[PDB]
């Protein structure tokens, strides 16, 4: 009958990188999504299946909350059936997605004069991720036929790449914090609703 922490997933001080997106499991809840929808601060609030009005009056076994920070123009790639950097190599959603995607600008918190390089993203990979797959390996990427043994140089690049966050960037270039909710149903008494 207690309120589980939507504050520790939305108002957390520091967010994880996109290639290492944070996942939290939410169970045994009474949940009021009305304040979430009426916050009037999210630049993007969209989801698929359940109507954005009927989340509270429907019961789920448990929820998964993923959080990360990406570029603004890349927020479009967080959707089922997408392609690109994030949708292929970093964070991929299944076609039959159910949860809701929320995204808001965080320029005042994640951007500094000179360049904020703490956030990384994967750039080179042999294949595409399966849905909900996380890869944090930092093995060297071999593009050519030369079997380089962990040396960065000719035809061998470090897969992870940093991005510079400036206060002078365009609105589509500025950092955006993204939270994705996924409700799942199994042979469970559906403890999460209210």
């Amino acid at each position, epitope marked *: 009958t207690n309120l589980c922490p939507f504050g520790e997933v939305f108002n957390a001080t520091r967010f994880a990188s996109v290639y290492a997106w944070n996942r939290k499991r939410i169970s045994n809840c009474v949940a009021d999504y009305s304040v979430l929808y009426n916050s009037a601060s999210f630049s993007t609030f969209k989801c698929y299946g359940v109507s954005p009005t009927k989340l509270n009056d429907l019961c789920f076994t448990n929820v998964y909350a993923d959080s990360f920070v990406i570029r603004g123009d890349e927020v479009r790639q967080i959707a089922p059936g997408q392609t690109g950097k994030i949708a292929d190599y970093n964070y991929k959603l299944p076609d039959d997605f159910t949860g809701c995607v929320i995204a808001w600008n965080s320029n005042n*918190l994640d*951007s*500094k*004069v*000179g360049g904020n390089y703490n956030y990384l993203y994967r750039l080179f990979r042999k294949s595409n991720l399966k849905p909900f797959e996380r890869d944090i390996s930092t093995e060297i990427y071999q593009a050519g036929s030369t079997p380089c043994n962990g040396v960065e140089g000719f035809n061998c690049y470090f897969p992870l790449q940093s991005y510079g966050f*400036q*206060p*002078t960037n365009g609105v589509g270039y500025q950092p955006y914090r993204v939270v994705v909710l996924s409700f799942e149903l199994l042979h469970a008494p559906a403890t999460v609703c209210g």
Partner: antibody, heavy 127, light 106 residues
Framework: EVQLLESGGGLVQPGGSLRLSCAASGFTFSSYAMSWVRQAPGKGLEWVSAIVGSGGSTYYADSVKGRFIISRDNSKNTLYLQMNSLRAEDTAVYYC????????????????????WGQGTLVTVSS | AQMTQSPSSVSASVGDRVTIPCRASQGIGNWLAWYQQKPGKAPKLLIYAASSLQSGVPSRFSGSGSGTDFTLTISSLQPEDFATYYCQQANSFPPFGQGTRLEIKR
């Protein structure tokens, strides 16, 4: 009403120690970065030091690295400035100040405007 | 090391429309604050994000500018507006410097 009440200022000899205090009220203290600013007679304001809401990241002015420590008790809604090895030129009025925006985690990361300001204590380093 | 530059003094009479120019280091973008100080007293946030009027501040104060050239303008100077004004880059705590003294013309 946000308020910031300063105490602990006074007269100390070169080399001494002083502890400043900035009691905070009217807001969720632990969510805001805070800073110490000072003004020596006949000079302009300078940031002494600053600290994010959690206390986990702090900044010091070059002239005071190694000699001052900033800290907070979020339980008591109080900010501190432990001052050691004071020098004559540390003589000033010390203000404490609150960050307009909430939620910084790193003291060099984000935008830092200071809406509320304490009244200031005078610190005198002299023999 | 200071990040912003405004003239040492501007001279004006009550009623006047006063502007204070400010040149910032490149790469500040939006993050420019204006602060007012009366002598001996704590400074007061007037404008933030280069053009946003801070809560409780009289509407005659307004801030404009893009890039590296910013400017504070006081439409209708009141006698209590004579003070020192600082333009301050709102990241990595630059020093205040001499600011701009707003004094009475004569």
């Amino acid at each position: 009403e946000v308020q910031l009440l300063e105490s602990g200022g006074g007269l100390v000899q070169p080399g001494g120690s002083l502890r400043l205090s900035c009691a905070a009220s009217g807001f969720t203290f632990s969510s805001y970065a805070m800073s110490w600013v000072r003004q020596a007679p006949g000079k302009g304001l300078e940031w002494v030091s600053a600290i994010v809401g959690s206390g986990g990241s702090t900044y010091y002015a070059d002239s005071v690295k190694g000699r001052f420590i900033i800290s907070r008790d979020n339980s008591k809604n109080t900010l501190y400035l432990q001052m050691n090895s004071l020098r004559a030129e540390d003589t000033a009025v010390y203000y404490c100040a609150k960050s307009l925006i909430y939620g910084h985690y790193d003291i060099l990361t984000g935008a830092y405007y200071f809406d509320y300001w304490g009244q200031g204590t005078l610190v005198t380093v002299s023999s | 090391a200071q990040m912003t530059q405004s003239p040492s003094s501007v001279s004006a009479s009550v009623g006047d429309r006063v502007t204070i120019p400010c040149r910032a280091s490149q790469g500040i973008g939006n993050w420019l604050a204006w602060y007012q100080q009366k002598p001996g007293k704590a400074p007061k946030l007037l404008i933030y994000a280069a053009s946003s009027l801070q809560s409780g501040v009289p509407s005659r104060f307004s801030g404009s500018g893009s890039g590296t050239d910013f400017t504070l303008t006081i439409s209708s100077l009141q006698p209590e507006d004579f003070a020192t004004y600082y333009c301050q880059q709102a990241n990595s705590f630059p020093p205040f410097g001499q600011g701009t003294r707003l004094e009475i013309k004569r």
